[PDB]
Every structure is written in C-alpha cells, then in structure tokens.
C-alpha cells in the first residue's frame, strides 16, 4: 500500500542504495555497480536449490554460527539493490525476484523466526540480520505484500521489542547507548515504517535522542572529546564510527516523520565532529588507538575506517546550511585531498555517497586548505593526539588508567593487543601506508613502540585489565605543547616505570624513571618498531656514522643519537639520547597472518620488514631519556641536538622535566608535593603534570592533577622566583 510510510522508505532507499542517482557514464558509480553485479552473479551461481535443502549457501551453512544468518540475508539485500537498478543486468529479472521472495520464505520457516532463540552472537540476531531484512524489504517493497512484510519482520519484534535495551530475550539484557543505540534506530525505525507502526517509530526516535547528551561518566561522548564504549574502552574510531555513519543515514528520514528531532538537540553532532573525530584523522587515516579490536580486521585498516567517518560528516554537511555546511564540506575536502595513499571511493558504497563526494571535490567554491596544528588531550579516555601542520606529522599517545581498559580482545578479535596502551606511541609521517598493508599481523606484539615490558610469554586467551593507578594524564598548554605521564605497572605486577612524554611543538621527549623488575624475565623499552617500505629505504646513522643493520640484533653502547634518513625528509626520524645510552637495533622480515590475531580473518601469510630499536633495563632504578625529532634532514637534526644539549632538567623517581629554550617552554611531571625549583626561575609545588611558558616576565601555566581530574588555582601549584 502506497502512503507516507512508503514515501519515507523511498527516501531510505535513496540513502542505502541510491539507484535513482545512478549514471552509467559516471566511472566511480559504474565501478560500484560492477562490484554488486559480481556479488549477485556469485550468489546466484552458488545457491542451493532442489528438494528444500539444508542450507542456501555452503560457505554460510552452519546456522549455529550466527554470522551465517547475517551473511545469508546480506546476499538477498544485494539482490534487492540490483533488481531495482535500471542499469543492472538483473533489473526486474524474474529469477532474482523469485529468489529473494522464496529465499525469505525458506529462512523464515527453517532458520530465523520468532520460535528461535539466540545461538552464538546476539548482535547477528538483533542488529546485523534485522538491518539486512529491513533493507531488502524496503528496496523490494513493490514485490511484497504488506502481510508478507509483517510476517518477515515479526521475528525482529521478538528479538528486539524494546528500543531502550538489547539482549531482551536473554538472561542478561543491557541498556543501548552510543553506536549500538543508532543501530537500534536502523532496526526499529525502518521495521516500524515497513509495518506501518507509529508507536514503534516514535518510541524508537525518543530512545535515540539520548545519543545527543554528553556524559560525565560511563559510555558516550564527553566534553573533552573522548568517546567511551563497552563500559570503559576508548572507542571513538569504531563504535563512534557506527554512531555517526548510521545516524547521518537515518536523520533525513527521521526529520520527515511525525516525530522529528529538535534542532537544538542535534547541535551536539557538530561538537562530536570538531572535538572527537577530526583530531583523530591525519592524512586520511583514523588513528588506530581509537579503534579497539577493529585494528585486527584486514578490510578495516586506518584509511578505510576513516571513510566511515568522512561519509558521515559529508551527509551531515548536506543536511546543514550556510556556514556550517560550507565548513564541514571544507573539512572533508581537505582530508580527502591530503590522502595520497587511499582512494576514498573504495569505501563509498552507495550512489548518493559517491555523488556527494564528487560534487564536493570539484566545487571550487568549497575551500580546501591544509589543516592547522592542534593538540587534543582526551583525558576521559587516556589518549592524546597531536598534529604539526608546519612540518607535517601527527603523533598519538595510547595510555590507560584505573578508569579505562588497556585493550579489547572479544569475539576472537585482537588476540595480541596486550601492550597497545602501555604507553604505546604512533608517528604519522609521509609514509601514509605505515600502519596499513598488514602492519597489525606482522608487527611483533611483544615490542610495541614506546612500551616498557618484560619478555614473558603471553597467552592469546588473555583479556584486558585496568591500571592500578589513577596517575595518568595530559596537561595541555596550547595547540603545540603538552605534557603527559603514566604511573605504569605491567600486567602481572612484576615491572614498574614512571613514563612521561613532553610534546614540544616539533618533537616529543620520552623520559622513564624508577624502572624496577621483580621477575627473572628481562626488561626493555622499545624505542621504535617501524614498518619499512622496500621502494624507499632508510640509511641509518648512529652517532652520525652510517650503520649496517642485520636480522641479528647489534649492540650500540654509548649512543648519543640515531638517525633514519629517507630520500623524502617528511619520512625522516631522529632519536637524541640526552645521556649516552646502550641500545640495540635490528632490521628483519616479520611474517604472520591476520588469522593469528583474529580467528575470523584469512590465514594467508603476510610479511613486512621492520626496524626495531630497544634499550635493556638490567638494574632496578634504571632510566631512559630521548627526544624523537621527525621530518628534518640530517644536518638540521645534528644542529638541533646541539641546541638541545642541556634540555633535560631532571629524570628521577619524583621529578621529570624537559626545557625547550627556543620556545621558552617547560614540561614537568611531579610524583610528590615537594618544592621543586626549575631552571633557577620558578617553583612548582604539587604532585601532577605541568606545561609552562615564559613570555618576557610573565608565565602561562597549565596544571593537571590526573587522579582528581582537576586543574588548580595558579598559586597552589606555581611560584615565581
């Protein structure tokens, strides 16, 4: 029956497929059509028929495996997309129309109905499969009766009756928030339209509106830009993606129902984009420290994941107007144009998304100016993101605390993420491919860059933990300078370190003190583990003399510096040791498979070459201290290290500080309330984290107490001499 419900479903069809916008002469659209043609062809050539089978497809045959339900129904959705595309060879095809109709009947009566209970993963029963059923019926609504559409969606109402909770039919239901709550909208708003049910529609939209509230605690978006999901995990870059991606699809539909959402409510979306999402996007890549277990998915490396966010932003731009529209258009445009590695179109999966992106990129009225420098201290999820526009590098610092989980191993994904928040750092430079092309299955998980660890073996079956200490956090002065610390204890309470970081515009100092080990395992800090490009080799220098690295580790006692020199200065990396230090280095081919870190991924062997730099800590009370200096040439690095000769102020069990004399900026971490006199110029008075600038006779002060999560009046913490 044609009415306002099907008008809304027409709009939905325009969003999830966009056949109305298809143009055979548009090369990018023709590529997506060909992909869908091939998928439908494969499905049709593969499908079982004859004598009411045991499965529809063999590759998805075991219905105790819940992923097989969703993958099966997603194949029917693909058929529904093509049967309604005038340019498809399957347009109005009699076999395809009957295949979809009769495939829905077979699954309904044999596999997935109201009489069933969840077996395997609840998310397939309540999200993945219902989304696929909804979209199939919406696209093919002119081939089904209203009674059939009700019949085929009754199962969705059995598993998901309550728009405020998931797992309703289990013995442990949970409250829907965040990305999962947006998915509640894609399930129940669309099912509600298909079944012409006003109460489902209105109740679901009301439930979704809690997504616009910033939170002080628990799951959701925070004022400082952090996003928490799964109780206590930093998650902007996977669950936050689902939130923005899904919500931006639903909103044009919701706003034309009888229950639209107040514009005042939706204003929070622009906060998310500017405060939460944008800082995590560097040269088209979404920072892995925000993506939880999704790093272990071969098809979702960081440039691919970023497109989920970017397509969400671009849809929000399209529903906005004036200066808000223009500025969001400009954000997407500059990010896409900065990405020389990944083709954004490879993850634009509907015709309207392709069309929107094309219009944006060719519209000379939309500005595309390189993004400026920024530094975001996401203290409410224990991450920090930094970007220098002058020199062209990003830096991410991945921590955890008593408030957050270190890593997520769940659903057999991310089995070796053990050390990815133990003070792991990321450097984003002119190698845009660095954390892609199989980084995650080939990196040595025992040597995550920045981390201080023993060499004890770890079990894949382990799960994450919180840190004993609350003394973890970042004090930000401005968009170029900040200081961080982490009162680190390792997973089995055999090793400690006071680890601190001094972000000083164009360089980052790494200081560690109080390094102790009560195990018989050996302790070391990984200075770096950098994935190489065979097309762009590094020439390595130690103390400014060329070194030949091998697979076998070589020791370099009395090292003042290491320099990794590329043909491209924007890939150069220097390490300056404040005090001569004993390090070791190697260059080696490392092999692995995605299946090693995620059971559901391919067992195909992958390999990459890595350069590893490490510093052993054989004695209690040990220390490290060095400056990472990216994106300068060798002569400039050599000059800078002379400038920085006396930049280390202190690195002991109670006080760590570095001074940048060129800027007039100090970073300081105090572990106690003693009076600390600094550079014969001022005193700092309280346990906590500081970044201070001198401008003539005045001081600008940024103090943070990580444990109480508060700053403090200047006079409590600072005294001029």
UniProtKB/Swiss-Prot annotation:
Catalytic residue positions: 180, 230, 239
Example GO BP: carbohydrate metabolic process
EC id: 4.2.2.1
Subcellular location: Secreted, Cell wall
Family of this protein: Belongs to the polysaccharide lyase 8 family.
Enzyme class: lyase
Topology within the bilayer: Peptidoglycan-anchor
Protein name: Hyaluronate lyase
Keyword hit for Glycoprotein: no
Interval of the full protein contained in this chain: 287 to 1007 of 1066
Molecular function as annotated in GO: carbohydrate binding; hyaluronate lyase activity
